[PDB]
């Protein structure tokens, strides 16, 4: 079984390593597979950011919350989050909701690339053979691979904590 051509060699152990061992790709229209890639990339970007936030919270770089709590916040990111007031947590929820609204109602993502919330596909050309420094597919694969790795890494951090301390 080969890639559904809308993903088209965009992941796996190698770039052309269509890996689905569950039939989550078959008999699915291109819009649904684009949705799957958009969800994967959003989950990734969120993870990749969350891992950095975790490691900068677990390394003592926990200002803005050092001041809010008016005392040194916990290095454990879960306990640090629990220390935050509900006002701050709901401000974070509201800001993420506003961001999600931005990329749906006023700034909808491109139809053929829903993961391109910034709409970067309107200013970049493509990877072409005339370009000696063409790396756009390479950086897309870097983003995807670090996304897939951080998606399991952040879960490792979260479930490792709150169950082992």
């Amino acid at each position: 079984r080969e890639a559904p051509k809308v993903l088209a060699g965009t992941g796996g152990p190698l770039p052309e390593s269509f890996w689905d061992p569950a039939g989550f790709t078959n008999n699915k229209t291109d819009e649904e597979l684009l949705f799957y890639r958009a969800a994967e990339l959003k989950h990734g970007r969120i993870a990749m950011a969350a891992v950095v936030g975790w490691f900068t919270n677990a390394s003592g770089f926990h200002y803005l919350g050092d001041l809010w709590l008016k005392k040194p916040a916990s290095d454990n990111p879960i306990e640090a989050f629990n220390q935050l007031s509900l006002l701050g947590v709901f401000q974070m929820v509201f800001f993420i909701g506003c961001l999600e609204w931005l990329t749906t109602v006023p700034c909808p993502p491109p139809k053929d690339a829903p993961w391109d919330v910034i709409g970067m596909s309107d200013v970049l050309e493509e990877d072409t053979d005339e370009n000696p420094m063409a790396e756009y597919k390479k950086i897309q694969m870097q983003e995807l691979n670090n996304s897939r790795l951080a998606m399991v890494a952040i879960i490792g951090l979260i479930v490792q904590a709150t169950t082992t301390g």
């Binding site: 931005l102 990329t103 006023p106 700034c107 909808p108 993502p109 491109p110 391109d116 919330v117 910034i118 709409g119 970067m120 596909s121 309107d122 200013v123 970049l124 050309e125 005339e130 370009n131 000696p132 420094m133 063409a134 790396e135 756009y136 390479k138 950086i139 870097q142």
Partner: protein
């Protein structure tokens, strides 16, 4: 090739070194290289040395020649010609599409993406250049969906929305960080100051509409600057409304 670049002994220059020198030198440059070029010194040593010419040279002159001539690898390696060809193709392409670097830690770090810096409509326009901050779909649909540009909005709606935003913002820096900070009426004084700032900037906008008459928002017919003046008046109204709402949310909760 040229007669003097034939059967050159390896001592003067390597065969690979000679090939690299020729590759990195323009074809029309031959037969008369400039005094500061590598090919000129290579030519000068190509004669007077080799075949029937002088086959020996003093040690000091040998050191001079070795200092003044390339040594193939790491100086005229095929990778260096590949990099020079890549650089010239890059500079050819940037007249067109430009690779995107970002200055990270003060040094430009290549990202991997190449921009469309060339303007879409007017090639020589200085403000039609394309950047992701100003030409990506997010920018187009973000600035385009703001009250100042959103489609379907009457001028009063744009004014009201911008005013509400400005008024709700302006109450902030006055209630705290002000003369009457640690007072029960800090919120009220901040509200009064925010309303004053909204009124002053609205008078300034009225002044702009009376003098410049921007005409960018006027409907058909009407008068020059009518749309902008309506926008500024409803900005004043919205500023009062947003400032009052911020003061309400401060007094409550």
């Amino acid at each position: 090739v040229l007669p003097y670049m034939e059967n050159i002994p390896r001592a003067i220059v390597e065969k690979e070194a000679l090939e690299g020198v020729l590759a990195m030198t323009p074809r029309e440059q031959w037969e008369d290289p400039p005094e500061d070029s590598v090919l000129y010194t290579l030519k000068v040593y190509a004669e007077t040395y080799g075949e029937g010419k002088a086959t020996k040279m003093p040690w000091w002159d040998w050191l001079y020649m070795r200092f003044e001539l390339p040594d193939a690898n790491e100086v005229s390696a095929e990778k260096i010609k590949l990099m020079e060809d890549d650089a010239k193709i890059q500079r050819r392409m940037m007249e067109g599409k430009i690779p995107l670097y970002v200055p990270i830690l003060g040094v430009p770090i290549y990202t991997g993406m190449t921009l469309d810096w060339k303007p879409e409509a007017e090639l020589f326009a200085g403000d039609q250049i394309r950047s992701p901050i100003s030409d990506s779909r997010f920018a187009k649909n973000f600035i385009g969906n703001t009250a100042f540009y959103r489609e379907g909005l009457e001028n009063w709606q744009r004014g009201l929305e911008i005013g509400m935003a400005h008024g709700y913002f302006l109450v902030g820096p006055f209630t705290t960080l002000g003369p009457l900070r640690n007072t029960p009426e800090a919120a009220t004084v901040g509200l009064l100051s925010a309303c004053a700032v909204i009124g002053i900037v609205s008078v300034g906008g009225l002044l702009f509409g009376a003098t410049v008459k921007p005409r960018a928002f006027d409907k058909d017919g009407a008068t020059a600057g009518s749309g902008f003046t309506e926008i500024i008046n409803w900005h004043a109204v919205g500023g009062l409304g947003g400032a009052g709402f911020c003061h309400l949310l401060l007094t409550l909760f």
